[PDB]
Amino acid sequence: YALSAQQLLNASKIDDIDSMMGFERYVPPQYNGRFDAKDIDQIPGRVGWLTNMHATLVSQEQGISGVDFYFLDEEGGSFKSTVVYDPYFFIACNDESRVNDVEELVKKYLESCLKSLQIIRKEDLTMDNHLLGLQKTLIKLSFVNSNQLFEARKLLRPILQDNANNNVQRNIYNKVDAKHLIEDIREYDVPYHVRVSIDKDIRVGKWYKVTQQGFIEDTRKIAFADPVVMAFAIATTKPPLKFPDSAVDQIMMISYMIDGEGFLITNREIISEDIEDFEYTPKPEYPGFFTIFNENDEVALLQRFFEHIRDVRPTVISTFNGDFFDWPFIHNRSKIHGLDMFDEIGFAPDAEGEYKSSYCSHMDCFRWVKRDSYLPQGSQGLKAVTQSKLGYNPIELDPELMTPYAFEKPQHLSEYSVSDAVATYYLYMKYVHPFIFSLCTIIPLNPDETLRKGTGTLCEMLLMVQAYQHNILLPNKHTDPIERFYDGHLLESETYVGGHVESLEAGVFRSDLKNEFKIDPSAIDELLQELPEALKFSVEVENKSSVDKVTNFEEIKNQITQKLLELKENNIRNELPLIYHVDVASGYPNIMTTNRLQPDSIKTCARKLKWAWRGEFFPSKMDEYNMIKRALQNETFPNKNKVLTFDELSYADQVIHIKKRLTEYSRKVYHRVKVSEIVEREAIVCQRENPFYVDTVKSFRDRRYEFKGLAKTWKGNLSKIDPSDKHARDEAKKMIVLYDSLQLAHKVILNSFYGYVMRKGSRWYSMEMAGITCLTGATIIQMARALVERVGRPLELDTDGIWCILPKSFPETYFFTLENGKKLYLSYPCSMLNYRVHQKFTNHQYQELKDPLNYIYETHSENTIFFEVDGPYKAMILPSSKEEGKGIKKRYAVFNEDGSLAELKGFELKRRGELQLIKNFQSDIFKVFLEGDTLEGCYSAVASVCNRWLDVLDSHGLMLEDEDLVSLICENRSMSKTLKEYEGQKSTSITTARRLGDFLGEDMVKDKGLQCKYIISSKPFNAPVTERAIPVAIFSADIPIKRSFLRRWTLDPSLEDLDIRTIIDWGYYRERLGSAIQKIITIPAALQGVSNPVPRVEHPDWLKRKIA
DNA sequence: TAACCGCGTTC
DNA sequence: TCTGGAACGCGGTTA
Ligand SMILES: Nc1ccn([C@H]2C[C@H](O)[C@@H](COP(=O)(O)OP(=O)(O)OP(=O)(O)O)O2)c(=O)n1
Ligand SMILES: [Ca+2]
């Protein structure tokens, strides 16, 4: 209909644009010989590196469905080739002996849109006897295009919903109709291009030969082709204190880089003078020679950008958040200027509002930064990312100086624009491009989708490929019920008990300051009894060798035994510690694969595993619940298109009202509004189920292990280089960052296999399997702690890792020597626990198909759960709570032996936003715990820094320049949603957002993600802090505006002193600094037996009493 | 006091 | 239409 025409027309537009960019549709010659990959060089065709793919319509050259594929050929050119393929989904039946009856129904019922029918079989993991070869019979419906596939779904849903409802009433005194035989539709929601990419085993990033028969992968060709890559960034005018408006604000410059060649177009109507060619090579490996394009006016600028793009023909354009700032600005500045960007460069927004093209992938690096970098949110800006992954500081410029510096210091502003471009091209080439394009080789998505789709969706794609290739029927996307009940109470949420976290000790621990250890002598007895087989376990399992080939096994056994035996005779010791960290490698994935954990396996073929369920429900019983429902049934409610009734509403809106009224009732009759209960649960895990899910996790884990191991290889290569070989250590350090980043980008995707069984809309949902994963790790990590606390002092614990200190005389690291001369590394702290993990947690019931033809299985033991050890570290600093007895989890600082920071967890320094005074305070303070000869001398050095920070606040800031003051006292906080979505809520961010609007206009709060830079006033006295919160920007406006809003915000019309120094609630920030000093310095010092080093910060009353 | 929320962390 | 999980710290309101 009118949908077809729009789609056929779009295909014609896209076809013309592709040809302008060098993608003419290529048809390979004919061949009547056998189609075999071995004979690839003789089958006529064209070879090309696959760079993109998109669904389209074809007109015998109604529309025909197909997928365009974009190639770069070996002769420096490009072409595209199309594959047609009939879209299809399946109809399931509830009586396989009458499948033809249903077949003859839908042939006539779907005669308007059906192209062909077929009876096919697939394996159904929910079917009885499916592990014996019994398959489910289905009707495969096929169509000419996707719109016809959707037309059939619209005709098939009435049948499915009518069968779910009961039958009509005819003769009350009384072979079923074939319409009732339709059980369900299946695989109806697979995106078409994912369907073609899976069924035809085509992947972006591989080499193919487009022949008449099909696509032949050329395994001979190895390395990727080199696409023409461009990355650009723009700079716009901006009213002071406000945001750029693509309506009124013009753009001044566009800076970009094409394969290393730098460019910068300028808008002379805004920037004052012509800019000469200049260079920005921030580090030697980032060459940046920039040729300038000075143009009269904005149109002239935009056509250079469009003409240059048209001439170099980029197949990848990279930006940094250019999907929601840059591209929409260029578009609107092209609309006002009468330029159609789509006819110019083939770029346009899509359904999600992101800007895309047919021939060119848009690589928004911010998506990679946000999803795969593993960097914190505070470190996700371009400057922080450039500092972390590129190893240099890019040029800075306060955005309020950008519009003026187009006039005053243009060249200064030309160096900032090129900086953003240099950092973006090399961020893409070094990190984003290799990662995403490699991922495309195994994921049936094009580059644009591999970069932006959620990691759970990426997992589902990987799993569907396995499911299809093993002829397993795809389950339909899971749907959660609108209401669930527990014990007669309406549930508000349910979950499983997740990871185990423990705060066990606080204070400073350093390798030069002795500690007191109490060694359980029975513990040493157990280690001595397990020592012979633990060392064998290290040889044969941990290093995949044989004790027959090690030549110092007895020496090592004796040295460890001697060290252990002395520790037993002296169980009370005051020694230097060893600050060690043990962590299970890929904990949850390895827990899953060890126990054959997968959603379809939750049902000696049965392994019972326990998990913990936690529910949150209303205190109201049924008898009450029904009462509030019938109350709302008698009420009127507004329409949404002039008044409706409860039952005339939707089910969703119904329970929305029920929940609100249920909360109110319980808050009165019960006072409590939500009750939480935990119940232990068991689940059967079949050990014989088709392991397509488990095997997918095992493969992707092994994929990550590759890069994780290379990061450890090169960490050792760098430790072997002499400090004088400067060029060698830089290459080694660059390898370390590259592989550490690659293994980290694989980490989120990996652990998303564990999270996917709880994702909304998941095809393989199982709360039980996730709950079992969490409880098992909780058992292992506590088993490990139970041993550490008997031999040393565990400090902190989270999920699968333990930080601890061990006596200096505890057996540490050893090196088996093989007859080959090669050595094997052994760390006894790790091997003692790994022998226990493999004594108590191995799955002895793991099963695999031996003979698949006769369906014979074998049973073996499996366990891939290993602690890895890092250390020994120079220092660890763990903070303590302000409340008595409580600890602080997920926060500490760790230092390497050479004095550099190893880890910094949780603290405000790294968190996004937060109070700059506390941020800057933490930066200066942690490195100071390294000073001092004794523990008491250590705390004194930190107190010196403390009292300097207390001095600036006690002096009401009089010691800082007013520029350093506006930065130290400000606190930034982001707003996830728009301010209108926070109605009925008070906070400092909301107040700042409201006042920013009453002063700079509602056009500021128009967009979510607003940063609220505020300072708290002492002005409304004894008033809630959420009200005394002023936008920092007010101290930067003209004086009348400042006083009006100030006096109003202070409730003091007698206010003429508009100096920020007088408005600040110094006592508030003095108390904030106090809580920081208490938790990092003084209160941990008390738990370590050192009197308050910072007496100006008084101890809590409970601490002063315990001191006595 | 304890429940409770928003944000951004550690797993 | 998209869309991995739970545990936790902290400032701040609220019952
Ligand atoms: N983003 C994350 C981080 C962690 N986890 C869960 C699953 C992990 O198995 C477990 C432990 O977290 P780690 O940081 O130890 O991650 P891994 O054990 O997977 O990796 P590593 O080998 O680096 O320890 O926490 C998760 O689900 N999602
Ligand atoms: Ca781990």
Author numbering: 30 to 90, 112 to 224, 232 to 660, 676 to 713, 719 to 1185
Give sentences copied directly from the paper behind this entry.
A series of crystal structures were determined of M644GPol2CORE (the catalytic domain of Pol ϵ (136 kDa)) in complex with dTTP or UTP and dCTP or CTP opposite the template dA and dG, respectively. The described structural changes were also found when comparing M644GPol2CORE-CTP with M644GPol2CORE-dCTP. However, a small ∼1Å shift in the backbone Cα-atom of the catalytic residue D877 towards the cavity between D877 and Y645 was consistently observed in all M644GPol2CORE structures when compared to wild-type Pol2CORE structures. This consistent structural shift in D877 suggests increased flexibility at the polymerase active site of M644GPol2CORE, something that was hypothesized when M644GPol2CORE was created for use in earlier studies. A deoxyribonucleotide has a perfect fit and stacks on the steric gate residue while N828 in the finger domain forms a loose hydrogen bond with the β-phosphate of the deoxyribonucleotide.
